[PDB]
Amino acid sequence: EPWFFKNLSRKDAERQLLAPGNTHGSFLIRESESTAGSFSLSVRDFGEVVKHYKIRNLDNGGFYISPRITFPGLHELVRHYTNASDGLCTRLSRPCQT
């Protein structure tokens, strides 16, 4: 998945998203370096800032950022927030470019 980044800290994710070639809505998902199975979504917004969202785990293996809408997988979460912001700072646009 072009949006999933391996072995990144929060500050690494921030630097990657603030790099030239990214813009409003540029995003990635990473795993916590400290907590196995805990994922987060990082999104570039506009000074120019990166917002982080905790992806919460359902016992059945699904995911949510807001309890209003849950997803059976990260692909479905990304597709949903690519369609509309639905409570995030902005609509997801392009996966983080390296």
The yes or no reply on residue 10 touching Cl ion (CB under 5 A) is: no
By beta-carbon proximity to Cl ion, the closer residue of 15 and 54 is 54
The yes or no reply on residue 81 touching Cl ion (CB under 5 A) is: no
By beta-carbon proximity to Cl ion, the closer residue of 19 and 54 is 54
Q: Is the dihedral of CA 61, 92, 87, 45 positive or negative?
A: positive
Q: DSSP labels for 7-36?
A: S--HHHHHHHHHSTT--TT-EEEEE-SSST
Q: Which of 3, 5, 27, 53 binds Cl ion (CB under 5 A)?
A: 53
Number of residues binding to Cl ion, judged by CB under 5 A: 2
Beta bridge partner(s), residue 54: 40
By beta-carbon proximity to Cl ion, the closer residue of 35 and 98 is 35
Q: Which residues, other chains included, contact 21 with Cβ-Cβ below 8 Å and sequence gap of 6+?
A: 97
By beta-carbon proximity to Cl ion, the closer residue of 54 and 79 is 54
The yes or no reply on residue 27 touching Cl ion (CB under 5 A) is: no
Q: What Rg, from alpha-carbon coordinates, does the chain have?
A: 13
The yes or no reply on residue 39 touching Cl ion (CB under 5 A) is: no
Site residues (CB under 5 A) for Cl ion?
53-54
